[PDB]
Structure 1
Amino acid sequence: LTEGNPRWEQTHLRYRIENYTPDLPRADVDHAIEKAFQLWSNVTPLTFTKVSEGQADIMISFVRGDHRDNSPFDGPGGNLAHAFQPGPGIGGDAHFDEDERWTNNFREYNLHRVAAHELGHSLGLSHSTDIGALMYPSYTFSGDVQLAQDDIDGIQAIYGRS
């Protein structure tokens, strides 16, 4: 018996940012998130619509400590965020630890760089063993956040090419 990995059957997904971190003005947050989805849709037939309310496949929220799911946060440092694999309810949701200081620059914990990674999970990717890949578990930032060939091959193996 062989089991496949969690996938979205549709290629058009809806997302919603439930709340905003006080760390950045709302404009920066929206842009960091929108830009992260754009990285993935660029290499696949996947499209993402942002809904301001109502149903959404990918629910994005900034929380801290125990937030009713089964992977509570740990305060500053350590785990910065986590996202769930495709599926109903929690499936596809991305959670960011409010206890971290989220930024829009080189200062530790650039939101966009982390969002790009967790969104990889929301679409079905697991971690990579390549320190150069976006799907690597460790926080790394060089100013620019682009997909490594490993992330590209990974996502395309599931959804196909653009």
Structure 2
Amino acid sequence: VLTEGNPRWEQTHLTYRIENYTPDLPRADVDHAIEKAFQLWSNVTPLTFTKVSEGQADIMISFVRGDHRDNSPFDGPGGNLAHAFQPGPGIGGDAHFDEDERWTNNFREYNLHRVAAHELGHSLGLSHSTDIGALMYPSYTFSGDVQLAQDDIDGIQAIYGRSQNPVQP
């Protein structure tokens, strides 16, 4: 047990990179969905996320289909719609999205941002909850706009703290 409890990120700032954009949606709209999710978490936490166009990033995001050299192949549109590894070296922190399902940004079948935000919850060590107003709810539900819940804000803030930032005149 090198780290006490679950391995938490020692740095207060993290970086991320998109390995590739699926032809499911234009990259311009995918960056907005992913960029908006990180901003929401950083908005209520002193944590910061910066996109990198080169070099290895703390969080790697990519899209894969069927079996992709992993011990958890997707079983058709059934099973989980995506998954991620625990925050750690090697494949740890990586997050894959099932490109077999059709991703959308409206009342369609599913919202890509809702699933992306859920993956971040697991990456930050956040667990599911019985609060229907929480995005990490086990059952998928259309809530329209995606916003964090007080239960989730207090949870991530308790681990790190409040986003205090005394600005000078």
TM-score using structure 1 length = 0.92
CA distance in 1, matches of 2:67, 2:105: 26
Larger RCO: 1 or 2 (CA < 8 Å, sep 6+): 1
83-92 or 109-118: which moved more? 83-92
Q: Which residue of 2 aligns with 1:24?
A: 25
Relative distance call for 1:65 and 1:2 in structure 2 (3 A) is same
- The aligned length equals 162
Relative distance call for 1:144 and 1:77 in structure 2 (3 A) is farther
Structure 2 unaligned blocks of 5 or more: 164-169
Partner-residue secondary structure (3-state), 2:69: coil
Percent identity of the aligned residues? 99
Runs of at least 4 residues of structure 1 off by over 3 A? none
CA RMSD of aligned residues (A): 1.9
Partner-residue secondary structure (3-state), 1:140: coil
52-61 or 79-88: which moved more? 79-88
Q: How far did residue 16 of structure 1 move?
A: 0.6
Relative distance call for 1:54 and 1:154 in structure 2 (3 A) is same
Relative distance call for 1:156 and 1:137 in structure 2 (3 A) is same
CA distance in 1, matches of 2:118, 2:13: 19
Structure exhibiting the larger radius of gyration computed from Cα positions: 2
Q: How far did residue 109 of structure 1 move?
A: 1.5
Q: Do residues 77 (structure 1) and 48 (structure 2) align?
A: no
Please show how residues 1-162 of structure 1 align to structure 2 within 5 Å: 3-162=4-163
17-26 or 128-137: which moved more? 128-137
Partner-residue secondary structure (3-state), 2:119: helix
**CA offset digits 1:106-154 (Å, max 9, x no partner):** 2122111111110111122122232221112222222110011111122
TM-score using structure 2 length = 0.88
CA distance in 2, matches of 1:50, 1:2: 27
* 8 Å contact from structure 1 (residues 83, 94) kept in 2: yes
* 8 Å contact from structure 1 (residues 24, 103) kept in 2: yes
